[PDB]
Amino acid sequence: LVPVGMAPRQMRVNRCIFASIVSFDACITYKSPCSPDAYHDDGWFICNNHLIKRFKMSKMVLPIFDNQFKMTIARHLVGNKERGIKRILIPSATNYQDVFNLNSMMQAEQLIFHLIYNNENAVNTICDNLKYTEGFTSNTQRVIHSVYATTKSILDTTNPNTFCSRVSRDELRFFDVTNARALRGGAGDQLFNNYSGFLQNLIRRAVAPEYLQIDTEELRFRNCATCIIDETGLVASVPDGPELYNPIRSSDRELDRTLSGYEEYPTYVPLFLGYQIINSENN
């Protein structure tokens, strides 16, 4: 054979977990929609398409600096008039089963969710049902094992670093309302702890802090919090009052004569919440 004995090769890797979704019915061909962003080796382990579809969230970059550091950040896709469950940007382990319609989506994605959210009972139930469903032995078993192995590999990559970050001294993050004189913030740190390691990593990659103390310099990106966290999870709600207007101009004459080529401020609502602290740059 061509390749050296073993010698693990090096190539790109699709990173979004949902890329592994495939129809257990081998006789039914299926292709999941993945944004090309999935092939960027970055902190994101979900592609733009899955992110928008499932969490109502869009990625975004925040320049930081002399040396222009780029901090990852997500933004709301939640409209102004959405209410209740619609406001759950990222459901908690106690609500994801309901927020996400497990019945309406594929069994593989349900397993993916019950893996991300640490639901061993549901994972085992799905595994046993697939064992006793369809031609499990022929190829469905191997497909299920492949999907499970991919998800577990991603989770094993993430969780150790997540735990090290949790216990880390140099880098500290606090997901709550920096306005301690507020009621919608609560024990945001406790809820973040309740979240899974991979979910915690996603939250870190998505929600930027309201303030950021680097060594001795503090940068205040907001005088307010654009999202909150409660038992339900990450909620796209204004902690103090009326919801922020989210036009959603895309995706799902004299005025212009004056307003020809002309700097325009985006109407997007980025995610700003909590306090972050760091020593040195570590970049």
Partner 1 sequence: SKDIVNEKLQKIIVVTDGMKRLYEYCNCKNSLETLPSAANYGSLLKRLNLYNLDHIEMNVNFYELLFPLTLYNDNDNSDKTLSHQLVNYIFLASNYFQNCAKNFNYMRETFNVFGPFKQIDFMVMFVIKFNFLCDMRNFAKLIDELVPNKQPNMRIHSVLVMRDKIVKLAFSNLQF
Partner 2 sequence: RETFNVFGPFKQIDFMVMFVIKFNFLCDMRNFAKLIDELVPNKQPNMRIHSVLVMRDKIVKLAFSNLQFQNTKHLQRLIMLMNANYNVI
| Cα distance between residue 19 and residue 100, in whole Å | 17
- What backbone torsions phi and psi does residue 198 show, to the nearest 5 degrees? -65, -40
Pick the closest to residue 74 from 236, 248, 205 (CA basis). Answer: 205
Taking phi over 0 as left and psi of -120 to 50 as alpha, with beta for the rest, 35 belongs to beta
User: In the structure encoding, which two tokens stand for residue 70, read together?
Assistant: 């780029």
Give the nearer residue to its own copies in terms of CB position, either 114 or 195.
114
Which segment (4-12, 104-112, 164-172, 191-199) binds its own copies by CB under 8 A?
A: 104-112
Region of residue 84 (left: phi > 0; alpha: psi -120 to 50; beta: else) = left
**Applying CB under 8 A, which part among 4-12, 164-172, 192-200, 222-230 lies near its own copies?**
222-230
Find the binder of partner 1 among 44, 148, 195, 275 (CB under 8 A): 275
Shortest distance, CB of residue 63 to partner 2, whole angstroms?
23
Q: What are 102's two structure tokens?
A: 């497990």
Check residue 240 for interaction with partner 2 (CB under 8 A). no
Nearer to its own copies, 104 or 121 (CB): 104
Q: Is residue 155 within the footprint of Zn ion (CB under 5 A)?
A: no
When CB distances are held under 5 to 8 angstroms depending on the partner's kind, the choice from partner 2, partner 1, Zn ion, none that residue 248 binds is: none
Please give the size of the binding site for partner 1, defined by CB under 8 A.
26
**Contacting its own copies within 137-166 (CB under 8 A):** 138-140, 143-144, 146-147, 150-151, 154, 158
Could you tell me the CA-to-CA distances from 79 to 47, 76, 199, 247 in Å, in that order?
A: 21, 8, 24, 7
x/- mask, partner 1, residues 202-241, rule CB under 8 A, reads -----------x--x-x---------------------xx
Q: Residue 278, Cα to own-chain centre: how many angstroms?
A: 22
> Angle, nearest 10°, between helix axes 141-167 and 197-206?
70
Q: How many CB atoms lie within 10 A of CB 207?
A: 29
CB 78 within 8 A of CB 228: no
Q: In the window 118-177, what residues touch partner 2 (CB under 8 A)?
A: 169, 172
Contacting partner 2 (CB under 8 A), which of 93, 118, 213, 222?
213
Q: Which is nearer to its own copies, 113 or 192 (CB)?
A: 113
Residues within the interface to partner 1 (CB under 8 A): 172, 174, 176-187, 189-190, 193, 213, 216, 218, 240-242, 275, 277, 279
